[PDB]
Each structure stands twice: as C-alpha cells, then as structure tokens.
Amino acid sequence: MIQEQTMLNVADNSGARRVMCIKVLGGSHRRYAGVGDIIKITIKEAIPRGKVKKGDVLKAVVVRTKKGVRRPDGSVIRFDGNACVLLNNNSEQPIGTRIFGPVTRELRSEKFMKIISLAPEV
Amino acid sequence: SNIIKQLEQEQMKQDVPSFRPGDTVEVKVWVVEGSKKRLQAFEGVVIAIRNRGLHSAFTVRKISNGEGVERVFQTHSPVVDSISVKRRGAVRKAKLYYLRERTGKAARIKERLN
Amino acid sequence: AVQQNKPTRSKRGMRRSHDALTAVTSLSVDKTSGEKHLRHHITADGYYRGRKVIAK
Amino acid sequence: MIGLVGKKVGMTRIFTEDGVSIPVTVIEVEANRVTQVKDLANDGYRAIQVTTGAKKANRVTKPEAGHFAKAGVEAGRGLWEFRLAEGEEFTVGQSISVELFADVKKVDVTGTSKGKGFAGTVKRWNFRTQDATHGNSLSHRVPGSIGQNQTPGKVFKGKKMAGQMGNERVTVQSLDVVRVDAERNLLLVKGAVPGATGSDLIVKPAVKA
Amino acid sequence: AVFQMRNVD
Amino acid sequence: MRHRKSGRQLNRNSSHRQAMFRNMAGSLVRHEIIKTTLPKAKELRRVVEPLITLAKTDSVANRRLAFARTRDNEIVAKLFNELGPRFASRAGGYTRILKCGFRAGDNAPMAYIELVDRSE
RNA sequence: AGGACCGAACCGACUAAUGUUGAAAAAUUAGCGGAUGACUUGUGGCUGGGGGUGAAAGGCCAAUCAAACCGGGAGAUAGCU
RNA sequence: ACACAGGUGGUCAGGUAGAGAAUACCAAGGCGCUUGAGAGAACUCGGGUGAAGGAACUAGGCAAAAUGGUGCCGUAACUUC
RNA sequence: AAUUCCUUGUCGGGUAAGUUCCGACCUGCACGAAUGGCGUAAUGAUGGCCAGGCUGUCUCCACCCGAGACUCAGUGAAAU
RNA sequence: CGAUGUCGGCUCAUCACAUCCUGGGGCUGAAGUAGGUCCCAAGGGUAUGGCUGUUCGCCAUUUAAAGUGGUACGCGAGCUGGGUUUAGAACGUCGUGAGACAGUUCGGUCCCUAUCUGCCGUGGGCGCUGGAGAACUGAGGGGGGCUGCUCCUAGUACGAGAGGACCGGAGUGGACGCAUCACUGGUGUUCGGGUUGUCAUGCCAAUGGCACUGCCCGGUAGCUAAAUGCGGAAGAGAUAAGUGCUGAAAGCAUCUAAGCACGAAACUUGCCCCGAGAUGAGUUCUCCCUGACCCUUUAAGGGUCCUGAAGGAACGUUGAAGACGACGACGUUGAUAGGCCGGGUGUGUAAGCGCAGCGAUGCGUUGAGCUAACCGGUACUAAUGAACCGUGAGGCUUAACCU
Numbered sequence A: 001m002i003q004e005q006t007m008l009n010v011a012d013n014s015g016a017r018r019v020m021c022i023k024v025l026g027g028s029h030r031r032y033a034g035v036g037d038i039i040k041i042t043i044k045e046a047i048p049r050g051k052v053k054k055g056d057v058l059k060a061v062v063v064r065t066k067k068g069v070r071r072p073d074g075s076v077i078r079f080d081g082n083a084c085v086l087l088n089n090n091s092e093q094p095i096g097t098r099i100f101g102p103v104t105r106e107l108r109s110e111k112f113m114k115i116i117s118l119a120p121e122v
Numbered sequence B: 001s002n003i004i005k006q007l008e009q010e011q012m013k014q015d016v017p018s019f020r021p022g023d024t025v026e027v028k029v030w031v032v033e034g035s036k037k038r039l040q041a042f043e044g045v046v047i048a049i050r051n052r053g054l055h056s057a058f059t060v061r062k063i064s065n066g067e068g069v070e071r072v073f074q075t076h077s078p079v080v081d082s083i084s085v086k087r088r089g090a091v092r093k094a095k096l097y098y099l100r101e102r103t104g105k106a107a108r109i110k111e112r113l114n
Numbered sequence C: 001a002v003q004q005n006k007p008t009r010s011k012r013g014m015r016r017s018h019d020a021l022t023a024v025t026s027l028s029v030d031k032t033s034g035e036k037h038l039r040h041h042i043t044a045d046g047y048y049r050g051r052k053v054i055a056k
Numbered sequence D: 001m002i003g004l005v006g007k008k009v010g011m012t013r014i015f016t017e018d019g020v021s022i023p024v025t026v027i028e029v030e031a032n033r034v035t036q037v038k039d040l041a042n043d044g045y046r047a048i049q050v051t052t053g054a055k056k057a058n059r060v061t062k063p064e065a066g067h068f069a070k071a072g073v074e075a076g077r078g079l080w081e082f083r084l085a086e087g088e089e090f091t092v093g094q095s096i097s098v099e100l101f102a103d104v105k106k107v108d109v110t111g112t113s114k115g116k117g118f119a120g121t122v123k124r125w126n127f128r129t130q131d132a133t134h135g136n137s138l139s140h141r142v143p144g145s146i147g148q149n150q151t152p153g154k155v156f157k158g159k160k161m162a163g164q165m166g167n168e169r170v171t172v173q174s175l176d177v178v179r180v181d182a183e184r185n186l187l188l189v190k191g192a193v194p195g196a197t198g199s200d201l202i203v204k205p206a207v208k209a
Numbered sequence E: 001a002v003f004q005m006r007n008v009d
Numbered sequence F: 001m002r003h004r005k006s007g008r009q010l011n012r013n014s015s016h017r018q019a020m021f022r023n024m025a026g027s028l029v030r031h032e033i034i035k036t037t038l039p040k041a042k043e044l045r046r047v048v049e050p051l052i053t054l055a056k057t058d059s060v061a062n063r064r065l066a067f068a069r070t071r072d073n074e075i076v077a078k079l080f081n082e083l084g085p086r087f088a089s090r091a092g093g094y095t096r097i098l099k100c101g102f103r104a105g106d107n108a109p110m111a112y113i114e115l116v117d118r119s120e
Numbered sequence G: 001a002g003g004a005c006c007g008a009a010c011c012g013a014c015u016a017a018u019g020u021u022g023a024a025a026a027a028u029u030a031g032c033g034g035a036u037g038a039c040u041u042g043u044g045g046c047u048g049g050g051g052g053u054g055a056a057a058g059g060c061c062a063a064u065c066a067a068a069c070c071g072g073g074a075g076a077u078a079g080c081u
Numbered sequence H: 001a002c003a004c005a006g007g008u009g010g011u012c013a014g015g016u017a018g019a020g021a022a023u024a025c026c027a028a029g030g031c032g033c034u035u036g037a038g039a040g041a042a043c044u045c046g047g048g049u050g051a052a053g054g055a056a057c058u059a060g061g062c063a064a065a066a067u068g069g070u071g072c073c074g075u076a077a078c079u080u081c
Numbered sequence I: 001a002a003u004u005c006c007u008u009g010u011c012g013g014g015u016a017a018g019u020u021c022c023g024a025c026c027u028g029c030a031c032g033a034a035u036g037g038c039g040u041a042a043u044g045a046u047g048g049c050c051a052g053g054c055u056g057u058c059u060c061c062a063c064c065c066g067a068g069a070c071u072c073a074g075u076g077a078a079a080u
Numbered sequence J: 001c002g003a004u005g006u007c008g009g010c011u012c013a014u015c016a017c018a019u020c021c022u023g024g025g026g027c028u029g030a031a032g033u034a035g036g037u038c039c040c041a042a043g044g045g046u047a048u049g050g051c052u053g054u055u056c057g058c059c060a061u062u063u064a065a066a067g068u069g070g071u072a073c074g075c076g077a078g079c080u081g082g083g084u085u086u087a088g089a090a091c092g093u094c095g096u097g098a099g100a101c102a103g104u105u106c107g108g109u110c111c112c113u114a115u116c117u118g119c120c121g122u123g124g125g126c127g128c129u130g131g132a133g134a135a136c137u138g139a140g141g142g143g144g145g146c147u148g149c150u151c152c153u154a155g156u157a158c159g160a161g162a163g164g165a166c167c168g169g170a171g172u173g174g175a176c177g178c179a180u181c182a183c184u185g186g187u188g189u190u191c192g193g194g195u196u197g198u199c200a201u202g203c204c205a206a207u208g209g210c211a212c213u214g215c216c217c218g219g220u221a222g223c224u225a226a227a228u229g230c231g232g233a234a235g236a237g238a239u240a241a242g243u244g245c246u247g248a249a250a251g252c253a254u255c256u257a258a259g260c261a262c263g264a265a266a267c268u269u270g271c272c273c274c275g276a277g278a279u280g281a282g283u284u285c286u287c288c289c290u291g292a293c294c295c296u297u298u299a300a301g302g303g304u305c306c307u308g309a310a311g312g313a314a315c316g317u318u319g320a321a322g323a324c325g326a327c328g329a330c331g332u333u334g335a336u337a338g339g340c341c342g343g344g345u346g347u348g349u350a351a352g353c354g355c356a357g358c359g360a361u362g363c364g365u366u367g368a369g370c371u372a373a374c375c376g377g378u379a380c381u382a383a384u385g386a387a388c389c390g391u392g393a394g395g396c397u398u399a400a401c402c403u
C-alpha cells in the first residue's frame, strides 16, 4: 500500500539503496498504489559506484508490499517490507541487471517480462 | 443456518491432515504460467491457524532470499493441493506473530517428538 | 441562544399539550384474594396468579 | 418479467473448478402464489399480488384471512405485488416457482438496509473530520458551517446533515446469479445483498442490459 | 471577571 | 449501535460489575431471596444459575472454580453439599423474577428474585 | 568545596486540554523550573496617597492604582445624550 | 457571599519492594465525597488499541507517542582545561 | 543583520521542489566601538532551521472502556 | 460607533457562464496525429506538495483538466489566532525630550445551555363522512449523470518519410456513491492464557483484589475499511449551434416565409428512493356490527337500559428496530428472552495425582481445562384468565342500473 512520502527498499542492483515515493502515478486524486503500479520516486541514497546517484528522480515499479498481493481464491502473499525496481524514466524497462527477491505473479504484463525473467522464485 | 452448513460441508474436502501450529509444512500450489498449469512447492512453518469450517485458512511464513514471505491458504480452496507435514514440532501459544520480528537463530522451533 | 421576544401563554400551552399524563388503566383482580393489582405485578399481600409466595 | 419474494439466510461462497473464489449470499425462496390478479378493468392496471411462508393460524387477522380465503389457500407471512410483463397471463392461485430464475442471468435484489440508528454527518455522508488538535476545541466530527450569511440566510432544503441512517428500502443493481436449486429453493446471487439475516427480500430481474 | 483588552481595529 | 450485544453497562465500569454482582449473587444464595432493581435482576439470572450448574457435579476442581467466583467459602459450602442435589433433574429455571411495584425513593422498578424451592 | 547535578516535600507557574452564567471573580488535569540558596516560611513590627515600595512591570499599596479608600466642599462642571 | 475540586504553620513517621518522606499494595485509623434509577444515539469530555505509510497535518513535531533503572564497556568538535 | 526600503539582492549548500536556514559577496535606503564593537566555552520552560527515533498530526478515520447528553422520579435556575 | 467581529487556513457548500476537461459544430495559413479561433452547452468532474501568516505567486511532479467569479473579498452564536490589532521589550530611523514609524523582530485569555425562522430526523392529534386490516395507483420531489488507459477495426483511410486515425466494438483502472462481513484485517476492559509488586483466603498448593484492562499475547459475535459486490448507461421523446430536401417572395438563387429530414454528457423520460395532509385527502381486496323507551326550542337533537364485534391499544418477553415515541416478532393450542443440552470458536496441555530431579522445572494423565455476544435442539423459568379503547348498519341531492 504505497503512498506519498513512503520510503522503499531498492529491489535491484541499480546502485540505489533507499528510495522514497514522492508521487503516485495513474489517475486523478489517486492515493494508494502497489502490486505493480508505476510510481515516480526520488533516490535518497545510493552506493558510490552505482549507475544512479543521490537526488535522482525517476519512475519505478513496485514489486513487493507489506499489505501483500491479493488472489482470486482469497489468498494473499504478504512481504516483510516494500520494494521496487527502477525502470527507465523515458520508456520503462529496468535499469539494474539483477532484480533481487521474489517478484509477484501480477507483474505478468508484457512490459514487466524483463523483470520476472530474473529472480528464479515465483 | 442448517441450510448454510449443509451447503458448506458438501464442498469441504475430507483429506486434510491434522497439523500443530509452528510445524514445518509444504504447501503445493497450482498456478497458471501464462499457459501450462505447472504446480509449485511452498514449504514453510505455520504461524497462524484460523479454523472457520469451510472458511478455514492458515498462514505460512517462508524466509527466502532475505526478507520473509508469509502466505495464507484456504483449507478447501481448489488451488491448494497436498499439505504434507515435513517436520514434527511444538510451541506454546498457537499464534506466532512474535516470530515476525525474530530472525535467524531466533526462528528456531523444537520438535514435538511424540 | 436566547429569545428575542416573549412567547404567548397560548404557545406555552401548546407546548404543554403533550405533557398530559395518561392513566395505565391496566389493574386486574387477584385470582384468589381478589384484591386489585397491576398486571404482571405481585399483590401487596404477596399473592400472584393465585399461588402463595413471598408471604411478607 | 415478474420478480419473486425471497429471504436472506447468510453469505457464503461457491468454489469453482478454476479455483476462483466467488462470494455468494444464500437466499431461500419458497414458491409464490397469486392471491389476486390486478387488471385494467377492475383495478385499472395489470399486475399480480403474491405471498409466501407460513403465518401462524391464530395470529392472522380475519380481515386478511378472508382475503386469503378468496384465493382458497392458507395465509402467507406477508404480501407483495409484482408488475406483469404485459405478455404474461397468470391464473389466480397459480404456484409460481424459483425455476423462472434459471434464465434471468442478472438480477437486482431489493431489501431493507440495516438500522444504523441516528448518526452524525460523518457516518452518513462520509464527511472528513476536522483537526484533532492545533488549538481545536469542541469541534471534530461536527459538520461546522452549513450556510453563507445574510444571503439566503436559510439552510438549503435537502442539505447533507446528521440524522437517521439505514432502515430504508434499497436495491443494488445487476447482481449476478450462480446456482438455481429448485429442490432446496436456493438462490445463490453473487456478492453481498442489502438486509439483515432472516429479513424479507424482493428479487427482481435487472432492468439493466 | 469583566476583563479589559482593547479594540484597536 | 449495540446489534446482537448482550449484558448491560448499568452506568458502571466493568471492574465494579465484576464485584457487585459477585457479592449480590452470594446474597441471593444466603437468604434464597433478595429485592433488587429489575434490570439488575435480569443480569443476576445469568450469574447465579451457572454457579448452580457448576454445583450439579461435585469435584475437587469445581469447588475451586466456584471459589474463584463469589469469594465466600460459606456460600460454596451451601453449594454442592445442599443446593447441588436439591434441583436434581431440573435443568435451568433455578430462579424466578417477580416485580413488586416501583421504589418510593425515585420510582425505581423494584423486582423480587428468588429460588424455585425456598426451604428455610 | 559549590548562587554545583538528578530528584520529593516546599516554592514557582513554561506548554496544552478542560472550564468560560465553571467546583473556582484565574482553577483543575498531564508534563515543567528551582529545590544549601540572590532559598522558603511562621510570628511580630516599619515605610501612608503626588506619598510608600519596587533585581523596574509606572507593577503593587486589602478582588480597584498614569495617583488607594472614606467623608466633606458638592446638587462641582457638562455648549453633550 | 455556599455543607465551595482553592488557600492554611508546626509536630507523630508501621509492614513489603525500593536509593528515598518518590511510587504500588497494606497495618492503625478514617471514608465511599447529600440526588438516584435506568437506556447504551449523535456530539462532547477523560482514556485504550489500530492494518499500510511515518510529519504527507499544521503558522509551527502543537498535542500524543517515545526515551526512562543499576553495573560495566566506551564517548567527538570545542574550551575559560 | 533583532538593523536591507528596493527584495523572494546575487552566488553556493541543504530538499524532487526551500519568501525561512547556513556560508559568502558589499550596491551598509538607514552597522559601529562603554546610548559599547567583535568573538566566545558553559548555561537557556529563549528565536529560526535540519535529521535519527517515535508516533492517528495527517492520508481516513475504525472499534472499545468511563463521565454527560437521552428517558423516568425528586429539587429547581440563568442571560434576554 | 446606547458595537455590523475585521486577512488566511480547516470544514461545509450554493449559484452564475464571459466553458478548464468531457459533448455537439463552423472556419482554418485544418494531410493525418495534434492545434488555432468562434458558436451551442453548467449534467458531472474540476491536484498533492516545497517556500511564505499569506490569497496570489514561483518551483517539483501529476492529471481527460487542476475554470473564472458571486455568495458581508461565502462560512469565528462552526473551528484555527499565524497575520493585523492593546498593555512587555529591542534594532534601524525621526525628535532636545516624552514618544512615533502600511519599518522589523520575540511574546501575548477567541464568551453564549437555541426562543423563533431554516434544515436533518422522528412522533402525537385530527381529517379524508360507518369502523377496521392490507395491497396500492404515482400527482409531485429528491438522488444518480466523471473519465483515462489498452486492444479489435488497423499499422488500414491519410502521408514523401516519420507518424497515425474519424465511425463502431471489447476489456480493465483512477475518483465517487450505495450495500455487505463471506474472505483479508482492525476493535473486541463481558473470553482464555503469560507475567511483575503487594494484600487477602490459617498455611503447602491453588485463586482472587489493586496498581491505566497493572503490563501484555491473542481472540467469538457485533461493528467497521484498508476488505468485495454493484451503480454512471443503452434506448426513446422533443431541441440548441449545425447539416439539409422541395420551394416561391425575387423567371435565377435561397434550410423557411407554406412544408419536410437529421442533430449534444444540457431538457423530458428511462435508473433508484420518498410519496394521496396529492384537503384535487384516489383505487382495489377483505373483515365486523341487523336490541328496547323517554325528554327537548322536532332534528345530522338530547339521553337511559340492554349490548362492547372486527380491530386497536395497554401490559409482559423482546429484537442484526430504537435518543424518547415509533417499527418487527413473541405471550402457555407457546422458541420471545434467559437458562439448559449438544456443537462450533477462541485460549493452547487446567485442578488434582503420579513419575524424574538436591532444586527451580519437566513428563504422563491431556488438545486437556475453561468458553462471552455464535449455531442446532430444549418449555426449566419468565411472558396470568381477564379487563381497556373502539358499537349496534352508517347524511342530502342527482344519475346510471337491478333484462
């Protein structure tokens, strides 16, 4: 259940460490976001040799949420912490060469195929 | 009332093994992969059982590649398959939310051995 | 939060119209002693539906 | 076409072969019978009056009991009217059944909402609460301003305000139906429906396409 | 209590 | 909005409800009959009777479970040893309500409550 | 050793709520400052109105102070309501 | 001005825990505070908890929350050491 | 600048974005040396800003425990 | 001026159209995509933040778009007191001075129990012409009316390439409304367990009281969103701008003057709710009442005796109904409430005993004990027989019928 001013763990080797959801993309007066919805984010922290640096702002896709992703059977897959992969701001597609952690099944949506191609679990 | 319970019991499966909370329990899960309906395993210690007749379900945590991954499962849902108990065990207090903070060696559970 | 003018006694009386009491008129003779008493209530002598109880 | 009277029993679910869990609300529907057929002649419009259930033989009033006696049949717990589909022509006393719901596809489920009792503006119209602090005093869930000044100088009619909530007729539209078990008189409409458990209901075919 | 204050409009 | 709730707050905190009923339940036992306000008596009916149901079968544990309530050895002594067998086959209905007019002190609805037998 | 430290009694009254025809003509509740000293307090005196006193706010001088209160000049004056 | 949640100096100093006259439970002893009985709506006051986020509220981290003990390890810029 | 009207001076730092803050430039409307200038460890229920932790402050309120509100009985005001 | 509280913010809005977005068109220096400009159209919708007390403004990033204004520059008997705007103080400047400055900075009590109008709800009374029980007809009124993205058509029309549709169809979200607890969660001081200090039950053991429910860990019902179902429409009617057909005045021409056809989220309906106090008080079905004499100003007259029906009310048990009334259900030919029996659920191995150990503790008995508000059964108890209210055939006039 991502919202404005929400810190998130980085989900890939983009070199970023901590991020924050400054804005929630996708519709007027929108509040909550998650599952796989795009959210533009600032980079509050990054490792020195990473592709990205501190203060960078770019769109990124949520991959994990504490609320978890719901399923038609009623089952839900909760996670200990939020995470997101840093898509390129210009035309999607992840920047990192390796996405850590088990991406959820809901990512299956053409454009996110590159992300789920990595990380053997789920 | 009885019209409800009769409707519920008919849909209930009769092949559910008993299991104590805190036991390690694999949970097979059928899932579409965009085509083939391959089954997938999901082993993990139980932390929260919730019996509600047909509505009964149980949480299953699994600490993988860093942060843990809890997953609830309906007992009677078609999606779930075998519910084997890979490891006998026992803990006081059926709820185990406190384990969510505990990690590594703190996550140990003694075998019931009886 | 206060009147700008003084109400007529008529307006006060119309307000008093709903204040009137109504007699219950539900008294009933005892099956045994025959003394009147309120329905679903025991007699002062303690009799109730003809059986003896309380006795005080 | 005509609707039928039903009765809520309790929300449940029906598992499907694909593993999807679709919620449903059990609604028993004893077969209706036409106590009287309204028409353009004697009544000025064509319609049917119907009833269901078994009211106690002692508690039924004679003025009603004769109205059921005209139908020649034992009194129901209540009475409800349904408009004719014009092309329909039903005989008096006919035992209409739940089987008609086999082809309805989608239905609206009329019912009475739960009595929330008297309630504030927040519970009733979802008004946001004011500041809980910052010097605030005796003002939180209160409606606050309800008008301008000397212009109008009166609250507008129909203004959103605190008052009685629930306990009124309502009808969710285009609810899906799943099973139609005539043997048990079941009516497993998809999703939640208005009304307390055990309350009377009025299921009708959806006007929506 | 009556108070005091002023009316500097 | 209540809805399917049971019991009554009776303008008192639960800590007081755990004590006043605890004493009044013993008071009803000691004299086999007491005068009290009707709503409080209806509350009392759900209190005293279960103790009798506990008194239906003597055991070392039930004496202590009874001891946790009422907190009076003199009352539980009347339990099991006397009040237990006396109801015998009967199931429920251990006590009855009988309203006795309104109190003079503030028009409070008075109502006597008493055991089915009364043999003292 | 200390106009030293934390912290009750004691003293003080920074914040906020409640109260605003209040329980109270300035309080209560939850926190706060000082607490061996330029400390606090009991008891009894001293400074009396253009004066007193003041680590100074023109504050305080019996719930009133850019001049207390009581009585008197006095039915002061008022081109004002 | 009240049978008023205010103000009023000194003296007597039990048990257990505790550094303590803090505080909790108790002894001696004194009280349940001069309107009650119900119902369990908003709203208001005094509190508890809350999933996701953690100042995005707001004039302002206001208010709540949080930190909290003893023993020990260890502790920077700066300095009138 | 507790002082600068122009003014949100300009530049740099902090933030995704900073009329506030820090540093500097001096074009000081209208700084200035006992009506004291500048600097300063410690001290502060002092002013402004940032951050960690913390949280219903908020997104958005939800439920529960008590005191009123409500009804009955007793007594019985107020401004206007 | 014998007082009209004064900027902004919070909350809550309402109206206007000189229309921000969506809709319908004209023209274009309109290829398409996307624009310019103008007309019609107010149904709905019409940003979060950073700075500043600010509206405004700038910046960051969204969005189909982040409209312009009225409403005492809306709204303090609704809130906030940051600004301004008292009494303290300081800086700059002015004056010999006290002081002053739409110059600046720090700090600074926001009262009122609703009489009427108005509004949100809920009742009593009476009328609707004999009384009563239900089903109603719908005059009228309110509510709802937003829209992206993607796919098919189609990489087709168009175009040099690049790009990329008009019409129509399908799917899925954002915002909003309603309903619901079945799931996922929260609350759950009435359920169970852990544990700290102390007191008490004579003590061992076992329990209880108090300390915010002592601190907590959970957790039934109920309630509730963050949870899941549905809703905006399609169609039709008459139109606005607009596109026309025929056709004279005016041999031609012309959408119009006669006539005729299309045309929008606006209008009238359809959709949902209220609703015959709709005094213009309507219909339909059913039920109940078929006794004897005087008085008076002699009639819609005043009473007595005999009668008291349908039904209602009162009382009691009550309710997922409720502030009080009301409303639904039950009241002995009986499941309304409590209890009870069984079950479920929560808590997770009671008490006691035995065994192992020097001991704290463990094991066995044992998924045991305890279970509130749940479910299925049960008349054990509490809902007494009655009495009360309400009557005794229901005006005049006219017409149509009683074949």
Ligand SMILES: CC[C@H]1OC(=O)[C@H](C)[C@@H](O[C@H]2C[C@@](C)(OC)[C@@H](O)[C@H](C)O2)[C@H](C)[C@@H](O[C@@H]2O[C@H](C)C[C@H](N(C)C)[C@H]2O)[C@](C)(O)C[C@@H](C)C(=O)[C@H](C)[C@@H](O)[C@]1(C)O
Residues within 6 Å of the ligand: E001, E002, E003, E005, E006, E007, G020, J003, J005, J110, J111
């Ligand atoms: C405790 C109770 C007191 O109330 C208050 O404290 C509130 C908070 C004041 O506002 C305070 C605070 C403040 C800012 O007003 C909120 C200020 O403006 C006034 C001067 O004093 C009031 C109401 C003032 O009225 C205001 O008078 C203004 C001149 C006009 C205004 N009216 C036109 C709207 C009116 O409301 C004023 C002067 O005190 C009223 C006079 C009659 C009093 O002195 C009376 C005896 C007060 O002691 C009091 C009412 O009992």
